[PDB]
């Protein structure tokens, strides 16, 4: 069985976690709590392959099922959407470990809702981000709306489309069976040491 | 022709022009000074922005991604592993706090580069004997990093091997010492490290 290793915490791994989950592939977790010979994370191990890279680790899956494109125009579009969400989470992710958090915190947020229109006009003419059928980067953006969420509550009034969306990811059968398993890792969104999505608890 | 748009730097699209050139596809730059998401790229029906999207999709087009999910992975891990670098360059040379931020990097950059030395031990370039498009996002890394720190190769004769070798491929030989060449900025002009006119 391919083993998936991480923090445990959402991390850089949570949209691979509900990849994984949609697509109802079994794999076992090393989950390595707060306290080859490091190790370097996240890894992924099946029989072929050892990956480490978190975009490499989710590509693959994605491409084990036929689900990056069928085309170069395709694929390039799916790696723009890619990119598209990978600006909003590493945006927080940047600034998550500052001291300074509170400050840059307003930089980042005043930007956010030029980044989330994006998906909002996109949305308004596809159910998922690439259309009927849902594609990995459905579950980065899952990802960033639960993480900018925490940051401002508020970030997602002006956009009832990403509502609606956030709202249809929870509703596949897989996804809200995981959600509600033993399995789902809640809390940390970042490393426990950050100043946000950090400690024990929301 | 293809056109390729991004401020007139070297920044996040110095690959892909070291790609185009090699692959020898004729393109036009929109090249902007001193409003688009930039990078961009427009061929014929697709128009791209997300310069990882652009340089892949170039690759993609001459059937240089892999030809299975294995290789295909293989080449995003290298992707991710030259971006942690790249990107790490990136993330500090705005910063005010640059100069302290720089001690930091240049501790935990010895321990990015073995990977790609060891990989390059037994392997002519990063995939083996044919050049694929994490080769230059590596060159254009190797390249920044030693603006930041000269010595930083002193220890890797592998990297420093492998930057000359990726020179004096013909395309990338001429394409160097052309007109078309941007030598400088390596950041957006007002970077506090690879910033200003000149070095």
């Given at each position: 069985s391919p083993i998936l290793g991480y923090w445990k915490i959402k991390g850089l791994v949570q949209p691979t976690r509900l990849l994984l989950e949609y697509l109802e592939e079994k794999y076992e977790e090393h989950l390595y709590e707060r306290d080859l010979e490091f190790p370097n994370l996240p890894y992924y191990i099946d029989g072929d392959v050892k990956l480490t890279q978190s975009m490499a680790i989710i590509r693959y899956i994605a491409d084990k099922h036929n689900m990056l494109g069928g085309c170069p125009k395709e694929r390039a579009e799916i790696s723009m959407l890619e990119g598209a969400v990978?600006?909003?989470?590493?945006?927080?992710?940047?600034?998550?470990?500052?001291?300074?958090?509170?400050?840059?915190?307003?930089?980042?947020?005043?930007?956010?809702?030029?980044?989330?229109?994006?998906?909002?006009?996109?949305?308004?003419?596809?159910?998922?981000?690439?259309?009927?059928?849902?594609?990995?980067?459905?579950?980065?953006?899952?990802?960033?709306?639960?993480?900018?969420?925490?940051?401002?509550?508020?970030?997602?009034?002006?956009?009832p489309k990403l509502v609606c969306f956030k709202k249809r990811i929870e509703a596949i059968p897989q996804i809200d069976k995981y959600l509600k398993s033993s399995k789902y890792i809640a809390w940390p969104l970042q490393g426990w040491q950050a100043t946000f999505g950090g400690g024990d608890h929301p």
């Open positions: 990978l600006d909003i989470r590493y945006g927080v992710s940047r600034i998550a470990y500052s001291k300074d958090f509170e400050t840059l915190k307003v930089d980042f947020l005043s930007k956010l809702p030029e980044m989330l229109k994006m998906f909002e006009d996109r949305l308004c003419h596809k159910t998922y981000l690439n259309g009927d059928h849902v594609t990995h980067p459905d579950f980065m953006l899952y990802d960033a709306l639960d993480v900018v969420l925490y940051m401002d509550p508020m970030c997602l009034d002006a956009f």
